[PDB]
Amino acid sequence: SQTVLQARARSERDVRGFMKTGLAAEHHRVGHLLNEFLNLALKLDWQRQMI
Amino acid sequence: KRMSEAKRVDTGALVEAGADLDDIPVYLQRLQELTEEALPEKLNRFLDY
Amino acid sequence: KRMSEAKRVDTGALVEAGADLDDIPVYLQRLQELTEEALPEKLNRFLDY
Amino acid sequence: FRRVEDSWREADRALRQSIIGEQYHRGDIVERLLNDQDALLNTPEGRVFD
Amino acid sequence: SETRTLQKIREATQELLKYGLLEEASKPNLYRIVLSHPEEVTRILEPLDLDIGIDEIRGLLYVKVRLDETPAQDEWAHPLVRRQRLNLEQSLLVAILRQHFVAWEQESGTGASQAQIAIDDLLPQLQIYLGDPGSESKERTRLLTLLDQLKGHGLVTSPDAHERIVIRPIIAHLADPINLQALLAWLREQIAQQT
Amino acid sequence: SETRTLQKIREATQELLKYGLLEEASKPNLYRIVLSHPEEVTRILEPLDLDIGIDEIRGLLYVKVRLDETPAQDEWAHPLVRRQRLNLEQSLLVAILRQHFVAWEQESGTGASQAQIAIDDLLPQLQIYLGDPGSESKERTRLLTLLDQLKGHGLVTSPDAHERIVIRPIIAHLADPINLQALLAWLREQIAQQT
Amino acid sequence: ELETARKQQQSLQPVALSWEKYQKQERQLADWLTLESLLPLWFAQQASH
């Protein structure tokens, strides 16, 4: 069962690391930029070498 | 008075604005974000979780 | 704005009073008490210790 | 348990790949966490674990 | 008889060319030497079709390809620049590193150059995009290869005994919101074409 | 502010730095530009402790450390130049090519013709001192690998369609020919000692 | 984080409430001022006739 708790804590890690976003202006801008870019990133076919 | 009171509990958002009428719109934007996020409603659920 | 700023750093002498013109006398009482008895005595205590 | 573990691993991976979403705001994320964990716990293997 | 540039200026400029960047927080005397004669160093670089940038608040001086008349095709074609072009895996790690860097900068403003992170934090991120080859050691090696490439590009310190690395401030000017938006437009075009 | 340096001269300088070399037999344009404008290029290189020598007879130009001989230490270390020490195989190969080049220059004078040698003559002379690596295929593989690495160092060209290389005239300006002669003495002693 | 968000929203809400209470008065005063920019000319017309 430890692995279950490990997955749970692992997800909570990236919930915590994400809720702290009371940022200043420029940081807020680049945060939107990066988030949009990452959401774009998923769509690609990473498994492909040539991609 | 209320505006200053709010800044007393700000964290990294309202500091970038004045404390009088000309900056009220920023406070209203932040209040909109807080209300729409509805974070305070989860409290009881998340304590139990 | 100034008096509200002061209440932020208060530690049990201004919270018992409002933040309007009628509350200036208590602000003055605290300020004079500080300047005349608190700062000197506490500085002396710190240096002596 | 060989599958309870896998189900929760997949739930965590889904939470990751979804949190990236720009449309998601903080209230969305907390809600999704609670819902995902409760839903996982609701499935049969979830009741086994419970 | 023959005019010679100030010895310290020559030293500082040659080292700065060697390493492509320079931090006050680590080599303060050369940083200040350059800041004493910025016109001189800009003049020195001018024949090379190279240029200089400044970030006083972060204490960083970084070289940048001059673009007054070079082909807009790509500054990477410039003969002197040696390390090859960036690739979108490195760009993904760059994006994650930039996110961590801005999160760090929130904590204490620009602060020091000590943008510390644990390697175990990166692997979960990459696993989502690059997938899971099902061997923790394999993915660790993959991440370390990417980090080595980035350190070759000067964006990250090499690992250390605590499996920690520190993000080089140079990242703030490679992941410049302008560059980010140009890349984002290019990548949106790429996806649109992918259909 | 400052007037842009002549474009052609900037191109010549940057290309020259890409190879530490210029040759009229290959690139008459930049060769001529630098030849007619030596003061400009030298002044451009002054800040980095760089300078160029020439051999118009050989049709060659090359880069060098402008630092005055033994300025403060006997042997020099420079930020933008890394002094690689060739492994014994490469040292032997460069020694044989140097002796062949000087012999050719005796045959035809100075710079009259670029020296040459075929794989046919090469392989026996290398196996004279190195022996059989394990096969003829491996022999040629190693030979071409060293040839390519030397070409990377600018000493040689790759074999043509007839498997004949050209020894670059740059060979005439190596750093420590005395060390090469000493290693050649050791090699010519070992060839007789081991047989 | 949830608790602080709750505090922030419970502070900002009164600010927006009072801001509405004040904007109401502002708009009530706008046209009331507009009365002053018209009364003399009205009474001038009436004096004429």
XYZ file of C-alpha atoms in Angstrom, chain E:
195
model
C 54.596 52.815 -28.839
C 51.741 50.701 -30.182
C 48.428 51.261 -28.428
C 47.370 48.413 -26.130
C 43.959 48.045 -24.527
C 43.933 48.113 -20.734
C 45.222 44.758 -19.544
C 42.311 44.230 -17.170
C 39.843 45.100 -19.930
C 41.462 42.557 -22.251
C 41.382 39.895 -19.537
C 37.741 40.524 -18.670
C 36.569 40.616 -22.285
C 38.486 37.478 -23.264
C 37.113 35.536 -20.299
C 33.601 36.822 -20.973
C 33.869 35.628 -24.563
C 35.165 32.287 -23.300
C 32.171 31.713 -21.034
C 29.540 33.725 -22.926
C 28.290 35.225 -19.654
C 29.432 36.470 -16.274
C 27.860 36.984 -12.846
C 28.791 39.589 -10.260
C 27.777 37.167 -7.508
C 30.557 34.755 -8.529
C 33.239 36.837 -10.307
C 32.541 40.340 -8.995
C 35.807 42.005 -9.994
C 35.456 41.193 -13.696
C 31.791 42.185 -13.652
C 32.670 45.575 -12.186
C 35.611 45.958 -14.573
C 33.247 45.501 -17.511
C 30.723 47.870 -15.946
C 33.473 50.495 -15.699
C 33.985 50.535 -19.481
C 30.870 49.046 -21.107
C 31.392 51.212 -24.178
C 34.898 49.786 -24.492
C 33.757 46.157 -24.442
C 30.866 46.858 -26.804
C 33.403 48.487 -29.118
C 35.708 45.477 -28.826
C 32.929 43.039 -29.713
C 31.640 45.155 -32.596
C 33.970 43.737 -35.303
C 32.934 40.186 -34.360
C 29.277 40.968 -35.137
C 28.752 40.117 -31.469
C 27.149 42.304 -28.842
C 26.558 42.719 -25.117
C 23.623 42.774 -22.749
C 23.244 43.917 -19.160
C 20.991 42.954 -16.251
C 22.087 45.049 -13.285
C 19.435 43.783 -10.872
C 20.499 40.171 -11.497
C 24.187 41.007 -11.892
C 24.544 39.285 -15.270
C 26.421 40.268 -18.414
C 25.755 38.024 -21.386
C 26.952 38.094 -24.963
C 24.376 38.157 -27.748
C 24.731 37.948 -31.503
C 24.690 41.304 -33.253
C 21.756 41.551 -35.656
C 22.268 44.939 -37.326
C 22.955 43.330 -40.708
C 23.369 39.588 -40.083
C 20.896 37.326 -41.908
C 17.583 37.113 -40.079
C 17.555 33.404 -40.984
C 19.287 32.475 -37.730
C 21.973 33.995 -35.532
C 23.040 30.402 -34.868
C 24.577 30.295 -38.353
C 27.125 32.822 -37.107
C 30.533 31.130 -37.496
C 32.026 31.938 -34.090
C 29.183 30.714 -31.881
C 30.078 27.070 -31.327
C 27.435 25.247 -29.289
C 24.678 24.047 -31.586
C 21.055 25.140 -31.709
C 18.523 24.371 -29.008
C 15.986 21.571 -29.484
C 12.499 21.260 -28.120
C 13.366 18.697 -25.466
C 15.927 21.123 -24.125
C 13.223 23.746 -24.567
C 10.794 21.731 -22.445
C 13.352 21.405 -19.668
C 13.996 25.120 -20.144
C 10.307 25.841 -19.652
C 10.183 23.795 -16.464
C 13.378 25.423 -15.213
C 12.000 28.873 -16.008
C 8.845 28.084 -14.059
C 10.919 26.981 -11.082
C 13.101 30.067 -11.487
C 10.196 32.508 -11.440
C 8.732 30.665 -8.460
C 12.078 31.130 -6.710
C 12.276 34.793 -7.726
C 8.884 35.400 -6.127
C 10.236 34.257 -2.768
C 12.988 36.887 -2.503
C 12.716 38.983 -5.648
C 15.756 38.596 -7.853
C 17.776 37.916 -4.717
C 20.885 35.804 -5.075
C 21.767 33.355 -7.838
C 20.847 30.461 -5.531
C 17.828 29.153 -7.460
C 18.087 25.695 -5.918
C 16.021 22.633 -6.812
C 16.186 18.898 -6.233
C 16.561 16.593 -9.220
C 13.756 14.395 -7.903
C 11.383 17.292 -8.608
C 12.186 17.435 -12.330
C 11.647 13.750 -13.114
C 7.910 13.824 -12.280
C 7.481 16.764 -14.654
C 9.262 15.178 -17.607
C 7.543 11.837 -17.084
C 4.266 13.453 -18.124
C 5.575 14.675 -21.480
C 8.407 12.303 -22.376
C 6.406 9.433 -20.882
C 7.478 6.638 -18.571
C 10.011 4.113 -19.939
C 9.267 2.144 -16.787
C 12.800 2.276 -15.366
C 13.474 5.025 -12.837
C 17.217 4.841 -13.466
C 16.722 5.151 -17.228
C 14.684 8.334 -16.873
C 17.206 9.695 -14.382
C 19.954 9.158 -16.944
C 17.834 10.819 -19.625
C 17.212 13.848 -17.419
C 20.902 14.066 -16.566
C 21.793 13.986 -20.259
C 19.415 16.865 -20.925
C 20.798 18.787 -17.955
C 24.322 18.210 -19.251
C 23.302 19.642 -22.611
C 21.773 22.678 -20.912
C 24.917 23.212 -18.849
C 26.691 23.081 -22.191
C 24.405 25.968 -23.104
C 25.242 27.546 -19.748
C 21.715 27.534 -18.345
C 22.322 25.220 -15.362
C 25.061 24.237 -12.955
C 26.284 20.663 -13.033
C 24.754 18.361 -10.409
C 26.269 18.182 -6.937
C 26.525 15.768 -4.014
C 22.968 16.516 -2.821
C 21.466 15.925 -6.277
C 20.748 19.652 -6.436
C 21.283 22.171 -9.216
C 21.012 25.947 -9.398
C 19.492 27.730 -12.375
C 21.840 30.155 -14.077
C 20.264 33.637 -14.262
C 20.957 33.605 -18.004
C 17.647 31.747 -18.283
C 15.679 34.934 -17.650
C 16.935 36.287 -20.990
C 16.480 33.100 -23.018
C 12.980 32.505 -21.652
C 12.232 36.171 -22.212
C 8.443 36.587 -22.590
C 9.112 37.905 -26.098
C 11.075 34.778 -27.013
C 8.458 32.649 -25.264
C 5.673 34.164 -27.347
C 7.639 33.808 -30.581
C 8.259 30.146 -29.758
C 4.626 29.698 -28.762
C 3.429 31.077 -32.091
C 5.875 28.852 -33.957
C 4.689 25.822 -32.007
C 1.012 26.629 -32.539
C 1.811 26.781 -36.245
C 3.557 23.430 -35.901
C 0.532 21.783 -34.277
C -1.846 23.307 -36.817
C 0.321 21.836 -39.567
C 0.493 18.503 -37.746
C -3.132 17.803 -38.662
